[PDB]
Amino acid sequence: IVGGQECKDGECPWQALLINEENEGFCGGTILSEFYILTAAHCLYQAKRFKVRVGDRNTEQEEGGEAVHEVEVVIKHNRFTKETYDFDIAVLRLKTPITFRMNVAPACLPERDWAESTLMTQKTGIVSGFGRTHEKGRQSTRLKMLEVPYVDRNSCKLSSSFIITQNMFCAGYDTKQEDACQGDSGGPHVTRFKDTYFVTGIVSWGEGCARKGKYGIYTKVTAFLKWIDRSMKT
Amino acid sequence: RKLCSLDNGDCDQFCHEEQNSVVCSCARGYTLADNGKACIPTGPYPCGKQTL
Numbered sequence A: 001i002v003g004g005q006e007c008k009d010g011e012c013p014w015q016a017l018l019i020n021e022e023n024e025g026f027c028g029g030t031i032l033s034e035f036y037i038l039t040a041a042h043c044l045y046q047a048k049r050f051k052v053r054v055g056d057r058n059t060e061q062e063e064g065g066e067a068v069h070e071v072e073v074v075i076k077h078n079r080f081t082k083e084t085y086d087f088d089i090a091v092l093r094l095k096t097p098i099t100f101r102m103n104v105a106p107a108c109l110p111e112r113d114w115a116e117s118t119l120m121t122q123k124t125g126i127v128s129g130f131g132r133t134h135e136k137g138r139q140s141t142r143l144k145m146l147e148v149p150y151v152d153r154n155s156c157k158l159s160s161s162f163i164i165t166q167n168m169f170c171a172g173y174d175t176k177q178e179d180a181c182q183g184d185s186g187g188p189h190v191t192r193f194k195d196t197y198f199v200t201g202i203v204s205w206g207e208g209c210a211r212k213g214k215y216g217i218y219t220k221v222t223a224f225l226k227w228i229d230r231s232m233k234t
Numbered sequence B: 001r002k003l004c005s006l007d008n009g010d011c012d013q014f015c016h017e018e019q020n021s022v023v024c025s026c027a028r029g030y031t032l033a034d035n036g037k038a039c040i041p042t043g044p045y046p047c048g049k050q051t052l
Ligand SMILES: CN(C)[C@H]1CCc2cc(N3CC[C@H](NS(=O)(=O)c4ccc5cc(Cl)ccc5c4)C3=O)ccc21
Pocket: A082, A083, A084, A085, A162, A179, A180, A181, A182, A183, A184, A185, A203, A204, A205, A206, A207, A208, A209, A210, A215, A216, A217, A218
């Protein structure tokens, strides 16, 4: 996350972190329930073997709430394509259930029609992760969050060098130096409604980080709610 | 602005228009309150709530 702020105690409890064999984070995820994590399908190539860590805010200290979970099954959307990042979504079923506590709670899944007319029409969403703090820098040791404005679909299409499919939406800033970045991929894009946070996106891709005339591109979770439901029912 | 277009139909969460009236509902882990509008968590650590 470029710009934004640190997630303070209890503020981003649905954040998950995919960790490789070296116990290093390479992607984010969103806690959906005690057994399931939502992530980007493209993250499932960044490491050969990975686990999921929850409750972490500082990768340098042990704050007592951290919990590592092994993955039982990987549910990658079969229509995901590396060519365009269309259908950039996956659900992970964990071997053991997550125990909710301070810094560990799920984000809500909304209903499609209501989310599209009421959540996605809000001014902003919130993105979070342990990703780079600058385009060329290293991964953040601290969990960060960033308020990102929803961007007009037309403007987004005009800004992009590549196709923005119906399974994508844009959020962020034209010129302001704030955006998600490398390592935030697969993490949460949530939208607040009356003090309740609903999952609305998955950090997907972008032409660099916080570039002028470019926005962050997110998987449109509302297009996959039925798919997620099926993935969680098995 | 009418029904669900008018302040989310006064619902805490989901709003549906059925037979030209507002019908409120809630995310899993919540139960619709007796006023048919508010959403009450059914157990600890309900989805979408920042912790403590
Ligand atoms: C040509 N096709 C393949 C399209 C679809 C997928 C994709 C990705 C990129 N890049 C270029 C580098 C960048 N990587 S990054 O690690 O800096 C990164 C990764 C994810 C992001 C996600 C958001 Cl929301 C914003 C910025 C992000 C930045 C990144 O994601 C460029 C073009 C295309």
